[PDB]
Amino acid sequence: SGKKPVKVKTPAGKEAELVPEKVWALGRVKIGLFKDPETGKYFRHKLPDDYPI
Template identity: 40%
Template sequence: MTCTTEVKVKDPTTHLEISIAPKKVYVIKNHRGNTIKIGVFVSPKTGQLFRALLPDSYSCQ
């Protein structure tokens, strides 16, 4: 299920900051026990998948 809420992330393949909705969102706990959100995105120019950290207030709709 693809999210529709867009966030600004830096595309590591083109090195540009783009506004895009994540393809999938994972909620995980890091080594300190804090909950973080990771989004999987598709680069619009190259089509490659990349990950980026999402803000805690992000909700997938």
């Protein structure tokens, strides 16, 4: 089932509400792996500090 959506900036520079595929703690910083739906390309982006890991 999907992860909680999160507002990210895409590598194109638009804000999108996207569902990460995978999330983890990068040391203290929470990181998600996202796919830009329009372009199909993967990118990583910081998650909120309270985001469920």
